[PDB]
């Protein structure tokens, strides 16, 4: 169940680890174009807040959600900002959304007095005053509903298949971040010279097994000269003293 294009539902996700590898294995996922960052480097950025919009659009107007574009359904119901950050995920769904008897569960607006700002959830069922004189009450001459409904049939080919599209836009370092991707954990070498990056500690020196008694939240190890001489290895409670050979 997804919301309509104009009545799009926004779900906010924060304070977790965002893994895109378990999401990239989707079968009908073909539409993918990211602008802010390279898609391969999505796992090494920390995000203040993440919200997603889910809505169903026709097969012909799939790319109308792309930033900087205009159209009948992309100018009156939902649109992306020109400086759109991130990228959307779209996949064809002609086995569930499409109905044999015709799917009429969504509405699209084609009539409007003016345009709407991108990232707007404001919509109404106000009639379109097409005629010069004011139109109120019931429909008369030049008085029509600004919105029209989908007409989805399985006999339709490309250009009419419904697409389930999720839009992943987010802020970039506007606050203490909440969502970060998975971080690289490249093995561990002991009793041998190695460069290390243990949670932001940079240096050189062989890593040896040590048995000092730390405390529940004691990570670093500081010596007399105020230099690191012990580190608590991430993903483990092990403590290793850093000394040359």
């Amino acid at each position, epitope marked *: 169940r997804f919301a309509s294009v104009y009545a799009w539902n926004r779900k906010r996700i924060s304070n977790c680890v965002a893994d895109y590898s378990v999401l990239y294995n989707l079968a009908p996922f073909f539409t993918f174009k990211c602008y802010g960052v390279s898609p391969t480097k999505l796992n090494d950025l920390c995000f203040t807040n993440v919200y997603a919009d889910s809505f169903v659009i026709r097969g012909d107007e799939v790319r109308q959600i792309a930033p900087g574009q205009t159209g009948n359904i992309a100018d009156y119901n939902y649109k992306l900002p020109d400086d759109f950050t991130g990228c959307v995920i779209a996949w064809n769904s002609n086995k569930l959304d499409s109905k044999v008897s015709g799917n009429y569960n969504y509405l699209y607006r084609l*009539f409007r007095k003016s345009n709407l700002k991108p990232f707007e959830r404001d919509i109404s069922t106000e009639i379109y005053q097409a005629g*010069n004189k004011p139109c109120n009450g019931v429909a008369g001459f030049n008085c029509y509903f600004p919105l029209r409904s989908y007409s989805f049939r399985p006999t339709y080919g490309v250009g009419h298949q419904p697409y389930r599209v999720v839009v992943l836009s987010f802020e970039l370092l506007h606050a203490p971040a909440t969502v970060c991707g998975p971080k690289k954990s490249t093995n561990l070498v002991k009793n041998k010279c190695v460069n290390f990056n243990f949670n932001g500690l940079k240096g050189t020196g062989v890593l040896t097994e040590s048995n000092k008694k730390f405390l529940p939240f004691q990570q670093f190890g500081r010596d007399i000269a105020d230099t690191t001489d012990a580190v608590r290895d991430p993903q483990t409670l092990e403590i290793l003293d850093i000394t040359p050979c």
Partner: antibody
Framework: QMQLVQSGPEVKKPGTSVKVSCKAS?????????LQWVRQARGQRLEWIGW????????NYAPRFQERVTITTDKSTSTAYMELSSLRSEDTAVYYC????????????????WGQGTKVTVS | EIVLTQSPGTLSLSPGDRATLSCRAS???????LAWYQQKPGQAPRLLIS???SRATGIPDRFSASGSGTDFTLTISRLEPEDFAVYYC?????????FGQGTKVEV
């Protein structure tokens, strides 16, 4: 120029199906403009066959015009295919398709354009 | 299902004279959805006044629409030689139009 083109007079027989097409040069059916059809006899009172909207798909017809007459709107060609069935001897008249110039900008509360129609006679 | 009454049915006036017509509808009263049309004998019809408040392109200044009640009045400044056609007044808000007999002006 703002003109409407249509086929010439036609002669037919009862018990058949008639398809009438009229195009507009310099005018388009767009999304807001809605056209209508009238039948004009030999100096007799007009009758409203029906009006349809190309975009919204609104269908309205006269009470006696809901079983033998149909209007199908084509946006790509901006035309109104008029389908008539079980035609009788009273259909010998001139059919007109009329639409106002209302294309996403402005329009009045009346019908502006008027084609020459088709002089259709059924024996 | 609309009954339209137009008066006068026939006009016998000298050419170039001012003319007045009135009409009424048996359906619900609408003040902004009345239009006046003229159809030539054997030629395509042309609109005269749309909405009873303004004219269209090419409409002469003679045609003027007025009326506060159900009756709608159309005034013509002078009996222009090529304006001698048949008049019709039509509503828009009510049921599908049942066009009246038609008021035709002639010498």
């Amino acid at each position: 120029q703002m003109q409407l083109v249509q086929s010439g007079p036609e002669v037919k027989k009862p018990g058949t199906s008639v398809k009438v097409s009229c195009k507009a040069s310099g005018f388009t059916f767009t999304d807001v403009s809605s056209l209508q059809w009238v039948r004009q006899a030999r100096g007799q009172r007009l009758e409203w066959i029906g009006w349809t909207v190309v975009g919204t798909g609104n269908t309205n017809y006269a009470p006696r015009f809901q079983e033998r007459v149909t209007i199908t709107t084509d946006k790509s060609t901006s035309t109104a295919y008029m389908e008539l069935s079980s035609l009788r001897s009273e259909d010998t008249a001139v059919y007109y398709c009329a639409a106002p110039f209302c294309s996403e900008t402005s329009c009045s509360d009346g019908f502006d354009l008027w084609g020459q129609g088709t002089k259709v006679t059924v024996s | 299902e609309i009954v339209l009454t137009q008066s006068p049915g026939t006009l016998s006036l000298s050419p170039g004279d001012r003319a007045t017509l009135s009409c009424r509808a048996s359906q619900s009263v609408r003040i902004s959805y009345l239009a006046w049309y003229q159809q030539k004998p054997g030629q395509a019809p042309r609109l005269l006044i749309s909405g009873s408040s303004s004219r269209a392109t090419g409409i002469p200044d003679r045609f003027s629409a007025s009326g506060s009640g159900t009756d709608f009045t159309l005034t013509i400044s002078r009996l222009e030689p090529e304006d001698f056609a048949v008049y019709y007044c039509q509503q828009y808000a009510n049921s599908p139009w049942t066009f009246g007999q038609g008021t035709k002006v002639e010498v």
